[PDB]
C-alpha cells in the first residue's frame, strides 16, 4: 500500500505542478503585454500627494 500510495501521490502532485506552471507562464506574458501597453499610452485626480 505504501508503494502504491507514493506513486499515486507523486503522479497526482506532478500534474498540479504542470498546471500551475503553465498558468504562471501564461500570466507572465500578460504582465509584459500590459506593461508595454501602458508605455504606449504614456508615449501618446485620484492620487495621493503630500506636503
Amino acid at each position: 500500500a505504501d508503494r502504491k500510495a507514493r506513486e499515486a501521490v507523486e503522479m497526482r502532485a506532478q500534474v498540479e505542478r504542470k498546471m500551475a506552471q503553465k498558468e504562471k507562464e501564461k500570466h507572465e506574458e500578460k504582465l509584459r503585454e500590459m506593461a508595454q501597453k501602458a508605455r504606449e499610452r504614456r508615449a501618446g485626480e485620484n492620487r495621493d500627494i503630500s506636503e
Binding site: 500590459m34 506593461a35 501602458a38 508605455r39 499610452r41 504614456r42 485620484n46 492620487r47 495621493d48 500627494i49 503630500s50
Partner: peptide
C-alpha cells in the same frame, strides 16, 4: 510625497530606461 497609481512611468533626468 506622490502616491503612485496602478500603471505609471518613471523617468530619471535625461537617462534611458523608463520604468513601469
Amino acid at each position: 510625497y506622490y502616491e503612485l497609481k496602478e500603471k505609471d512611468v518613471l523617468k530619471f533626468g535625461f537617462s534611458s530606461r523608463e520604468y513601469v
